[PDB]
Each structure stands twice: as structure tokens, then as C-alpha cells.
Amino acid sequence: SHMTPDIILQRTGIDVRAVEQGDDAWHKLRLGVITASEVHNVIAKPRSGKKWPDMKMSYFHTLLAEVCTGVAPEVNAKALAWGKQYENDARTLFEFTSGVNVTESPIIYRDESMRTACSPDGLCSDGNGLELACPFTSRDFMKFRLGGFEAIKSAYMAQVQYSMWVTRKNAWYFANYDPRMKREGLHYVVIERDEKYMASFDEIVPEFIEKMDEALAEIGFVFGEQWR
Amino acid sequence: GSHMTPDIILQRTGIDVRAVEQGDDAWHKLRLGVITASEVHNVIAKPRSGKKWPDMKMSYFHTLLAEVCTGVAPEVNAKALAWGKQYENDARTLFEFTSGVNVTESPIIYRDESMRTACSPDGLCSDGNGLELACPFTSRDFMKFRLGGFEAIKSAYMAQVQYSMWVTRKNAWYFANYDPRMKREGLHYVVIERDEKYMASFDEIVPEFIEKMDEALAEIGFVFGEQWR
Amino acid sequence: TPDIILQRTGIDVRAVEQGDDAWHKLRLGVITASEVHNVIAKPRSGKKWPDMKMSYFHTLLAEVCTGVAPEVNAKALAWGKQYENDARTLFEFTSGVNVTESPIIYRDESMRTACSPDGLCSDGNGLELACPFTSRDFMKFRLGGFEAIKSAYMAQVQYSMWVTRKNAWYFANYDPRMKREGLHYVVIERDEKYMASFDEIVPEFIEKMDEALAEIGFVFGEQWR
DNA sequence: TCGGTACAGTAG
DNA sequence: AGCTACTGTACCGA
Ligand SMILES: [Cl-]
Ligand SMILES: [Cl-]
Ligand SMILES: [Mg+2]
Ligand SMILES: [Mg+2]
């Protein structure tokens, strides 16, 4: 909103625009930041009471750990490698099927505070963003192919809605790709901006940030240390 | 009342069923999109509430449809299958000593000519019974069966055993576990009789499941059998 | 004493490089501190052993009858073993207490129950010194104290005091990734409600194990031959 | 309680 | 960011 490339450079020493999604600089820029693919944890509610669910508390401590250590752990598994492997082919096939042009984007922060950001799978020539998924199980691709909007995983929905909150955009493509499918290997939908989600982020996210600052202060740390 | 023949299998898959051995390439091919004994508990599963299909049933529903449309199936539980493969012969040789019946290895067996439903027994016995001979990856699981008997693990395996009897049209089935790590007495088994309650469940539930699969396949322009051609 | 253990296991405690074949052999069939939570687990209503408890029951019986144990946490143990020396050194500096490394400790001659402390302290306390695989877990404890992790570790700590007949126990976490202040610890006092729980539930669990072993023609001790 | 299913939680 | 896959608790109707 008042975010500028210079602010990023002065705080992190990193030139945004030169960041090629997945490189050392990209990992560095996400440290301690409430990000799209993880925000489902922030909006998670107890079924009774007000006590934070374990998944919310776990993400809370994960972000704080990133601030105080200045690092994030690396995990590897077949499903993760699969998604990484076919992302490029998914995007190309999406462009060919939909007829829209996709531009790759590095991280996008909501504002100058750098507390909140998303890393879109692409930005489209029609003003929509793009999220791709390449399910490791053909089962889960089939679930999306047959069910569509109502079949979308709640984590992906929170991720897509958060991306619209961050970028101030109004619509986001959600595409699934399976290279193993003989036919019908690509399926996508358009997810509209949901103001119920926007209201939820406007309420829960700033409170999550204040809670983090309180926690950092208790232990003698301050947000930003991960970048110095 | 099956009208299934080896020629039907050969024409639509290209595979000689008589040459099939459990775990081979042809074995895996012949199981694509097919409702199998080890997975049927998903098909006959009932909701926690309401009248809709339970989550686990919808998952298997999507799993089988995916096999039809991709022509492949992922290899899960590699460690346990390799363990079972390593001790297949020893288990069988010990089972034959203890029981006093001879075991003949079997290819995949389909219920009927539609090739929608099948089982793969660990052997067929000289007394007319089929055989399930597991080599549990964890000794804990062997011990559970050793001490609790049939009643302890009926939740996990009764459906599978009954389905094998539904497929083969047999009246009884051996359910056995072998654990080579046991210092002595590493074989335990029970005999399970054909249960007509389970047979009635398969007769009403399975065909409906098949019909809903064909509906979904048609919705995306696929037909059962594309996995084999 | 080591000579009694040597006579019954064929393993000399003074040796044991950890965690070798002999290290794992000593725990076979033994109710251990980090697994005791399974023994003390109750159903929400009634008296039937919950699945966790039955699972552990069968796991232990399998260890006696097979004389082997599967190995988990290859990644987590490799992390801990790398930093165990630096963890202890920093704990000694912070606490002002000196730590002696301790082999396995059995509660009694029956050798049915044991704990494996990360050290025995000069003030008389025991030590649990963990290097959590995630910095997330370090932070949970750093900010929440023992209230944040009592769910997971109170049983293990209390059981260790039950086994050793000690009155207090250090619970510490070390994280080398922390830019500063990478050691956090609390002192946990002996809880007599936990002691009473063990005095009741542990003996009956052992009795039920021996009953099952006798049913299948096995006896405790066979794993060490 | 029994005999199960749904899903939070979390490793990898 | 990447997507399961397994464990254990919550939950549900009889
Ligand atoms: Cl222990
Ligand atoms: Cl121990
Ligand atoms: Mg992405
Ligand atoms: Mg994606």
C-alpha cells in the first residue's frame, strides 16, 4: 500500500524483481511473514471457547522461530517433489487451455510492514491471479475434477482468498494438473473474492501480529532481526 | 454363476491369466480399477451420521476412478509388501506342515465376466478352503492376533476374508499370520466360515458402487476397460 | 549395579557406545519412561484398556518373544547426538550445576521398569536434556514453560523420578539455531499423585504381561539370551 | 461402552 | 511452497 522496492532493499539487502521464486533470496524474504500457503492456520477456530487450536499455536511458534533463528528448516518428500516437478508444465497447459497470458511473480507484500505476503503461482493478463496444484495422488485430482468448487481443500481456499487480500485483486484462478491422466488432465475454476474471508483477515491477522510482537518482546527479540 | 473365461481376459487385456503370479506386472495390470478384497471395507463402510457415503468410501471411489483414467496405480507400503514377499515361501511351507493341507498358488480371481470385482488369495487349499497368509510388518500386529484371535482383528480383516469367499464362491477361509522374528511358534491361524450377512451386503452394495463409478466415468468421457487398452 | 545387569543381560553397562545393539537390547520388554504414557492412559468411561495401551502391551510382548525392536526417528536421533555435548556444556554453565552422564537405570531387581536420564546432577536432580528437531518446539517451551509441554512430557519426567527415587528433575531444551539464548530449562518437582498412579497401574500392567507370556509359553528374560 | 468414522495435528 | 500419509483424539448412533 505504501510498500516500495527500496524498503525491501533497505531492510533485507535484497532486490525484489530479481528474485526468481525458490532461490535463497526468496526463502529469506518469507522469514517470520504470515504467508498465503500457511494462513489457514491463522484463521483456524476452536469448535468451542476461544483457546487457539494447536495448528494455529504451532504456526505462531513456527514464525517466531524463524525470527529468532533467521532460518527455516528444509523438508523433503515424494508428494512435495511431485508438486515442484510439474508446476511449470501445469502453468504452460493452463495458458494453452484458458488462452490467458501468465506472468511469474516473486513475493508480494500487502503493505510496508512486511508482516503479510503471498507468492502467487502466476499473474494473468486479465487481472486475475493464478494458483496451480499438481496432486501427488490421482485420487485427489479426480476429487477436484468431479467436485469442482465444493471439492477445493480448505487450506487452498484460505490460500487463494488471502492472496486476493494481499494483492487487492478480485478473482483468482485455481487449476489442477495431472500428467498421468490420459485425457482431462487439466481442470480449473475461477474463485471470486469473498468478503467473509476479507473480514476474517482484517480481524484475525492484525491480532496475530500483535500477539507475535508481544511474544518477541517477552524473549528480547524484535521482528526484522531475521534480515539483519 | 460366473461366465468369465480366460479368453475374455486375453482379448481385453492381452494377458494370460494362467501365467499370473501374485505381485508381478500382469497382476498389477489386472487389478486396475477393480474392487479388491483388501480394499472392499471402504465400499461397505457406513456413515457416522446421515445417509450419504462416508469419506473413506468417497476416497476409494476416487482412487479406483483414477486408476481407470490414468491406467496406473501408485505403489504404497513398499516396505510391508517387500517383507511379505521375502517370507511368502517360508510362511506357506510352515502353514502346510501345521495344518496338514497342501496349498496351490492362484492368479487373480474375478467374481464374474464384468471384471469389476476380484480377489488374490495367498493360496487355495486341498480341503476346499482359500488362504489368507499375512506376514505382518510389525510383530505387535502378529502378537495382537496370536493373543486375541479372530475377535481382535475382525474389524480389520473380516470384510476382506468374506469378500474372497463372495468372489470365489467358497464356504470357508484360512486366515493366517507368519512372523519369522518370533523365536518359536511364529505361525498362527484360524478358520473363518462364509457369513451370509456379508454376502447380502456385497450383493446390494457392490453393484450400486459399480453403477456410480460408471456414471462418474461417463461424466468425464471415460469407459471402464480403457486402463487395459 | 552394573554387575547384576551384566549377569542377566550379557551386556556390560560400563561399555555401551550408544545407541548400539547392546544399548537397544537392554530396553527389550522393559517399561520405559518415554513410553509410560501408554500404560497410564485410561478410557473416558469404564475400565477397558484404550487402544494406545493395548498397542504398547503388544509391542512389549513382541520384544520379549522376538528379541528385536524396530528403529524409528533416524533423523531426530542424529540431530540430538550431534548437539548433546554442547547442550550439556551450556546447561552446566547456566544452571551452575555439574552433570554426570548416566547409563540406563532400572527401578528394581525385576528389571521390568527403567529410565534413561540425559544426566545425573550434582545437586541430586535428574536431567532431561532435549535438542528438539524443530525450533518451533523450542519456542513453544521457551514461551510457555512446562505448562505448554506437560501434556507430552510430564509422565516421562515423573516416571523417571519414580524409577530413581529422586525428588526433582531438570527439563531442558537446547537449540543451536537460536541466534542467542538457545538454552531453556525448568525444574519439575516430584508429584505424589503420579507416584500413586505408577504404584497402582504399573504392577498390574506387568502382571497382565506375564499372564499373556505364560499363555503362549514364554517368560520374561528370554530376550536376553 | 461398542464399533466404528471424521478430522486435527504433524512428519516428511 | 510443495501434498500427502500416518497417528491419535473427537465424535456419532445403537
Ligand atoms: Cl526412557
Ligand atoms: Cl529407558
Ligand atoms: Mg506456489
Ligand atoms: Mg501451487
**Dist CA C204 CA C192 (whole Å):** 19
Taking CA–CA distances from B217, the nearest residue in chain A reads A146
Helix ranges (DSSP H) in chain A:
5-12, 24-29, 54-69, 78-98, 138-147, 154-167, 195-218
**Amino acid (one-letter) located at B132:** E
Burial grade of A199 (CB within 10 A; 0-12, 13-18, 19 or more): exposed
- C136 and A219 in contact by Cβ < 8 A? no
CB atoms within 10 A of CB C110: 11
- A219 and C142 in contact by Cβ < 8 A? yes
A54's grid cell? 494447536
| Phi, psi values for residue A186, rounded to 5° | -120, 135
Question: How far in angstroms lies nucleotide D4's C1' from the CA of residue A127?
Answer: 49
Contact C197, C218 (CB under 8 A): no
Strand (E) or helix (H) holding B149: helix B139-168
- One-letter-per-residue 3-state SS of C52-93: HHHHHHHHHHHHHHHCCCCCCCHHHHHHHHHHHHHHHHHHHH
**Dist CA A164 CA A192 (whole Å):** 9
Q: Is residue C128 annotated as involved in ligand binding?
A: yes
Question: How far in angstroms lies nucleotide D10's C1' from the CA of residue C45?
Answer: 28
Question: How far in angstroms lies nucleotide E2's C1' from the CA of residue B180?
Answer: 40
Residue B78 alpha carbon to ligand 3 centre in Å: 30
Question: How far in angstroms lies nucleotide E10's C1' from the CA of residue C55?
Answer: 20
Cα distance between the two ends of chain C: 20
**Amino acid (one-letter) located at C218:** F
Asked if omega into C80 is within 30° of 0 (cis), the reply is no
Question: How many domains does chain A fold into?
Answer: 1
**Dist CA B188 CA B199 (whole Å):** 26
Across-strand partners of C63?
A: none
B197's grid cell? 450377512
CB atoms within 10 A of CB B96: 15
Contact A159, A37 (CB under 8 A): yes
Taking CA–CA distances from B144, the nearest residue in chain C reads C58
Domain that holds residue B181: 1-229
CB burial of B63-84 (b: ≥16 within 10 Å; e: otherwise) equals bbbbbbbbbbbeeeeeeeeebb
**Amino acid (one-letter) located at A6:** D
**Dist CA B74 CA B76 (whole Å):** 6
Q: What subunits make at least 3 CB pairs under 8 angstroms with C?
A: A, B
Across-strand partners of C121?
A: C99
Q: What subunits make at least 3 CB pairs under 8 angstroms with B?
A: A, C
- One-letter-per-residue 3-state SS of A155-207: HHHHHHHHHHHHHCCCEEEEEEECCCCCCCCEEEEEEECCHHHHHHHHHHHHH
Residue A61 alpha carbon to ligand 2 centre in Å: 30
- A65 and C179 in contact by Cβ < 8 A? no
C35's grid cell? 513410553
Chain E nucleotides covered by protein, CB below 7 Å: 1-6, 8-13
Residue C33 alpha carbon to ligand 1 centre in Å: 4
The residue written with cell numbers 481382535 in the block is B152
Closest to A129 measured CA to CA, from A197, A175, A87, A176:
A175
The residue written with cell numbers 542424529 in the block is C78
Q: In B, which residues are within 8 Å of C222 by CB distance?
A: 183
3-state secondary structure at position B101: coil
Burial grade of C127 (CB within 10 A; 0-12, 13-18, 19 or more): buried
B94's grid cell? 510352515
- A142 and B69 in contact by Cβ < 8 A? yes
Looking at all shown ligands, the one closest to residue A174's CA atom is 4
Closest to A167 measured CA to CA, from A67, A54, A36, A46:
A36
Looking at all shown ligands, the one closest to residue A155's CA atom is 4
Give the list of residues 6+ apart from residue B218 with CB closer than 8 angstroms, or none. none
| DSSP codes of every residue in B122-140 | SEEETTS-EEEEE--SSHH
Q: Is the CB of A36 under 7 A from strand E?
A: yes
3-state secondary structure at position B68: helix
- B66 and A142 in contact by Cβ < 8 A? yes
Cα distance between the two ends of chain A: 24
Question: How far in angstroms lies nucleotide E7's C1' from the CA of residue C149?
Answer: 18
B134 torsion bin: left (phi>0), alpha (psi -120 to 50), beta (else)? beta
Q: In C, which residues are within 8 Å of A76 by CB distance?
A: none
Strand (E) or helix (H) holding B147: helix B139-168
Contact A154, A169 (CB under 8 A): no
**Dist CA B207 CA C117 (whole Å):** 59
D9 C1' closest Cα residue: A55
**Which pairing describes strands A102-103 and A122-124: parallel, antiparallel, or unpaired?**
antiparallel
Q: Is the CB of A51 under 7 A from strand E?
A: no
**Nearest-CA distance from C72 to chain B in Å?**
13
Question: How far in angstroms lies nucleotide D9's C1' from the CA of residue A54?
Answer: 7
Looking at all shown ligands, the one closest to residue C35's CA atom is 1
3-state secondary structure at position B170: coil
State CA B76 to chain mean position distance: 15
Contact B191, B171 (CB under 8 A): no
Q: Is the dihedral of CA B212, B213, B219, B223 positive or negative?
A: negative
**Amino acid (one-letter) located at A77:** A
Q: In A, which residues are within 8 Å of C178 by CB distance?
A: 68-69
Q: Is residue C118 annotated as involved in ligand binding?
A: yes
| Phi, psi values for residue C52, rounded to 5° | -55, -45
Q: Is the CB of A31 under 7 A from strand E?
A: no
Q: Is the dihedral of CA C117, C118, C122, C125 positive or negative?
A: negative
Q: What is the DSSP letter of B175?
A: E
**Nearest-CA distance from A107 to chain C in Å?**
23
- A61 and C143 in contact by Cβ < 8 A? yes
Q: At what angle do helices B55-70 and A138-147 cross, to 10 degrees?
A: 100
- C217 and B182 in contact by Cβ < 8 A? no
Residue C188 to residues C103, C167, C172, Cα–Cα distance (Å) = 21, 9, 10
Report the residue of B62, B63, B215, B226 to disrupt the A interface, i.e. the one with the largest count of A CBs within 10 Å: B62
Give the list of residues 6+ apart from residue C5 with CB closer than 8 angstroms, or none. C11, C13, C26, C106, C111
CB burial of A25-57 (b: ≥16 within 10 Å; e: otherwise) equals bbebbbbbbbbbbbbbbbbbeeeeeeebeeebb
Q: What subunits make at least 3 CB pairs under 8 angstroms with A?
A: B, C
| Phi, psi values for residue A70, rounded to 5° | 70, 15
3-state secondary structure at position B158: helix
Q: In C, which residues are within 8 Å of A67 by CB distance?
A: none
Q: In C, which residues are within 8 Å of A62 by CB distance?
A: 134, 136, 139
**Dist CA A164 CA A142 (whole Å):** 26
B140's grid cell? 505387535
Q: What is the DSSP letter of B102?
A: -
Contact C139, A73 (CB under 8 A): no
Across-strand partners of B187?
A: B178
Looking at all shown ligands, the one closest to residue C155's CA atom is 1
Q: Is the CB of A132 under 7 A from strand E?
A: yes
**Dist CA A49 CA A64 (whole Å):** 25
Cα distance between the two ends of chain B: 27
B106's grid cell? 492362484
Give the list of residues 6+ apart from residue C113 with CB closer than 8 angstroms, or none. C30, C31, C106, C107, C163, C202, C206
**Nearest-CA distance from C183 to chain A in Å?**
12
Q: Is the CB of B51 under 7 A from strand E?
A: no
Residue B103 to residues B106, B131, B133, B176, C155, Cα–Cα distance (Å) = 9, 8, 11, 13, 50
- One-letter-per-residue 3-state SS of chain C: CHHHHHHHHCCCCCCCCCCCHHHHHHCCCCEEHHHCHHHHCCCCCCCCCCHHHHHHHHHHHHHHHHCCCCCCCHHHHHHHHHHHHHHHHHHHHHHCCCEECCCCEECCCCCCEEECCCEEECCCCEEEEECCCCHHHHHHHHHHHHHHCHHHHHHHHHHHHHHHCCCEEEEEEECCCCCCCCEEEEEEECCHHHHHHHHHHHHHHHHHHHHHHHHCCCCCCHHHC
Q: Quote the strand ranges of chain B, DSSP E.
A: 35-36, 103-104, 109-110, 117-119, 123-125, 130-134, 172-178, 187-193
Q: For chain B, what percentages of helix, strand and coil (3-state, to nearest 5) are there?
A: 50, 15, 35
The data reach a resolution, in angstroms, of: 1.9
**Amino acid (one-letter) located at A118:** C
Give the list of residues 6+ apart from residue B86 with CB closer than 8 angstroms, or none. B135
Instruction: Name residues with Cβ closer than 5 Å to ligand 2, which is an ion.
Output: C 32, 114-116
Q: In A, which residues are within 8 Å of B222 by CB distance?
A: 183-184
Can you give the CATH number for the domain in which A178 is found?
Answer: 3.90.320.10
Question: How far in angstroms lies nucleotide E5's C1' from the CA of residue A155?
Answer: 17
Taking CA–CA distances from B58, the nearest residue in chain A reads A143
Strand (E) or helix (H) holding A116: strand A116-118
How many residues in chain C?
225
How many residues in chain B?
229
Method: X-ray
Q: Is the CB of A77 under 7 A from strand E?
A: yes
The CA dihedral of C213, C219, C222, C223, to the nearest 10 degrees, is 40
